[PDB]
Design an enzyme around this catalytic site. Structure first.
Site, mmCIF file in Angstrom:
data_model
loop_
_atom_site.group_PDB
_atom_site.id
_atom_site.type_symbol
_atom_site.label_atom_id
_atom_site.label_comp_id
_atom_site.label_asym_id
_atom_site.label_seq_id
_atom_site.Cartn_x
_atom_site.Cartn_y
_atom_site.Cartn_z
ATOM 1 N N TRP A 50 0.809 -1.223 0.000
ATOM 2 C CA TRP A 50 0.000 0.000 0.000
ATOM 3 C C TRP A 50 0.845 1.277 0.000
ATOM 4 C CZ3 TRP A 50 -0.002 3.381 4.307
ATOM 5 C CH2 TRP A 50 0.751 2.919 5.409
ATOM 6 N N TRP A 78 9.748 -15.179 -4.428
ATOM 7 C CA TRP A 78 9.254 -16.538 -4.206
ATOM 8 C C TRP A 78 7.734 -16.654 -4.346
ATOM 9 C CZ3 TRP A 78 12.267 -20.490 -4.667
ATOM 10 C CH2 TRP A 78 11.860 -21.760 -4.230
ATOM 11 N N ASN A 79 6.988 -15.904 -3.533
ATOM 12 C CA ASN A 79 5.512 -15.970 -3.535
ATOM 13 C C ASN A 79 4.863 -15.646 -4.886
ATOM 14 O OD1 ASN A 79 5.187 -16.831 -0.829
ATOM 15 N ND2 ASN A 79 5.182 -14.712 -0.069
ATOM 16 N N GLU A 119 11.949 -16.850 -10.206
ATOM 17 C CA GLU A 119 12.443 -18.070 -9.581
ATOM 18 C C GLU A 119 11.574 -19.277 -9.952
ATOM 19 O OE1 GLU A 119 14.177 -17.483 -5.543
ATOM 20 O OE2 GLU A 119 12.860 -15.742 -5.372
ATOM 21 N N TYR A 120 11.864 -19.975 -11.053
ATOM 22 C CA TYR A 120 12.931 -19.679 -12.012
ATOM 23 C C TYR A 120 12.366 -19.984 -13.392
ATOM 24 C CZ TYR A 120 15.427 -20.756 -7.691
ATOM 25 O OH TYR A 120 15.816 -20.826 -6.384
ATOM 26 N N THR A 190 23.550 -17.798 -3.775
ATOM 27 C CA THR A 190 24.331 -18.849 -3.107
ATOM 28 C C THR A 190 24.010 -18.933 -1.615
ATOM 29 O OG1 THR A 190 26.220 -17.298 -3.159
ATOM 30 C CG2 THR A 190 26.249 -19.125 -4.723
ATOM 31 N N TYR A 191 22.746 -19.234 -1.331
ATOM 32 C CA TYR A 191 22.251 -19.471 0.022
ATOM 33 C C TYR A 191 21.036 -20.409 -0.059
ATOM 34 C CZ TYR A 191 20.200 -15.017 -1.680
ATOM 35 O OH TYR A 191 19.639 -14.020 -2.450
ATOM 36 N N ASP A 192 20.498 -20.806 1.096
ATOM 37 C CA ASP A 192 19.501 -21.887 1.202
ATOM 38 C C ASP A 192 20.028 -23.176 0.579
ATOM 39 O OD1 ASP A 192 17.584 -19.946 2.281
ATOM 40 O OD2 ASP A 192 17.246 -19.342 0.191
ATOM 41 N N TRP A 339 21.428 -10.711 0.932
ATOM 42 C CA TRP A 339 20.050 -10.955 1.337
ATOM 43 C C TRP A 339 19.982 -11.209 2.859
ATOM 44 C CZ3 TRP A 339 15.741 -10.426 -1.689
ATOM 45 C CH2 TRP A 339 14.527 -10.813 -1.097
#
EC number: 3.2.1.14
Length: 379
Positions: A50, A78-79, A119-120, A190-192, A339
């Site tokens: 908003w 992602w969502n 993604e992706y 380069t994470y998760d 991130w």
């Protein structure tokens, strides 16, 4: 070197000391700032929150204090999923409509470029043709940016992308040599690299493989991923290494087994600030340490971990950030991306390491200049 820091428009909703607004960003800390995320309606870029317009103004206003700071808007996340991207790239007419909307949007709100966060392509719902159509999309966006620059007599808008670290996702997602000719920067996520979803303990962003990593598990480290991109057509200078200011937590199935690869029974708890399951912000981890958690060093992978009773966390600290920063320089990559800025100890009240301890580490290690942040004796 570049230091690119992602700011997230949902950090505003965190309670007390967790609330992070654009004005909490030190303008002299990073070289690039990226706003996550923008959305899409009828193949045109849109806001998602908003108050995004207000936040955009504060965000891009930071450039008044740093004459070399550049800002980008990130679309996707992602969502958001893949469906809107698939539909938008499916025809040249939809692509032109999107591109036109993006040029107008970025110029209206004073952003210097766009970061693609699809993604992706080719995975997570996206069909096989999207791999090539992403290249085509990025090609056309770069071309339109180049042309617009001559039309309004200003420097070109930037085009960048956040990209997969998973090898199969990389292989089904990107035409690396051709794509790399159009993108200004490639932000490798380069994470998760490990999480509770695997059913055993593992590190979020290990620099190297664990000695027992065999087969495809041997690909789950910064070293392998970054070198995969390099070897397959992406210029080292355009490649930006992903640095996480959070870690993943786990429930230990057996509290007496606290090593890498120890069985787990689920995600560790969400913290009271970020409220993300199986994740703690760095400042949330500092609280965990303050409450007596045992500190471990995963030496082969150059990253810390910690545990208390049945709770285990794999993460990054000042030491690991510095080690990877040094590594990045030895291998001549373009810099680091973070991130996320709002997950570092920005207040400096949780970790007793100063304000922005993790991102300050990267600024120092990459030798970033601060001359552009100068302020005169004018009120």
């Amino acid at each position: 070197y570049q230091l690119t820091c992602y700011f997230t428009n949902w950090a505003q909703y965190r309670p007390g000391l967790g609330r992070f607004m654009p004005d909490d960003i030190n303008p002299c800390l990073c070289t690039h700032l990226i706003y996550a995320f923008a959305g899409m309606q009828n193949n045109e870029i849109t806001t998602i929150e908003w108050n995004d317009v207000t936040l955009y103004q504060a965000f891009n206003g930071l450039k008044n204090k740093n004459s070399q700071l550049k800002t980008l808007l990130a679309i996707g996340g992602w969502n958001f999923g893949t469906a809107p991207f698939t539909a938008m790239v499916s025809t040249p007419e939809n692509r032109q409509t999107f591109i036109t909307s993006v040029i107008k949007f970025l110029r209206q709100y004073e952003f210097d470029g766009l970061d693609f966060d699809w993604e992706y392509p080719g995975s997570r719902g996206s069909p096989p043709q999207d791999k090539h159509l992403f290249t085509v999309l990025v090609q056309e966006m770069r071309e339109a940016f180049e042309q617009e620059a001559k039309q309004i007599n200003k420097p070109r808008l930037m085009v960048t992308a956040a990209v997969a670290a998973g090898i199969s996702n990389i292989q089904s997602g990107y035409e690396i040599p051709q794509l790399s000719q159009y993108l200004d920067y490639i932000h490798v996520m380069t994470y998760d690299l490990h999480g509770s979803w695997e059913g055993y303990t593992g590190e979020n962003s290990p620099l190297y493989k664990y000695p027992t990593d065999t087969g495809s598990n041997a690909y789950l480290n910064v070293d392998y991923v970054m070198n995969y991109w390099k070897d397959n057509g992406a210029p080292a200078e355009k490649l930006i290494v992903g640095f996480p200011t959070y870690g993943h937590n786990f429930i230990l199935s057996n509290p007496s087994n606290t090593g890498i690869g120890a069985p787990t029974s689920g995600a560790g708890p969400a913290g009271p600030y970020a409220k993300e399951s199986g994740i703690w912000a760095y400042y949330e981890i500092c609280t965990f340490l303050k409450n007596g958690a045992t500190q471990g060093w995963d030496a082969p992978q150059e990253v810390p971990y910690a545990y208390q009773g049945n709770v285990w966390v794999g993460y990054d600290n000042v030491k690991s950030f510095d080690i990877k920063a040094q590594w990045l320089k030895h291998n001549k990559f373009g810099g680091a991306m973070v991130w996320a800025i709002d997950l570092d100890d920005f207040t400096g009240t949780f970790c007793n390491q100063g304000k922005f301890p993790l991102i300050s580490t990267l600024k120092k290690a990459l030798g970033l200049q601060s001359a552009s942040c100068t302020a005169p004796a004018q009120p």
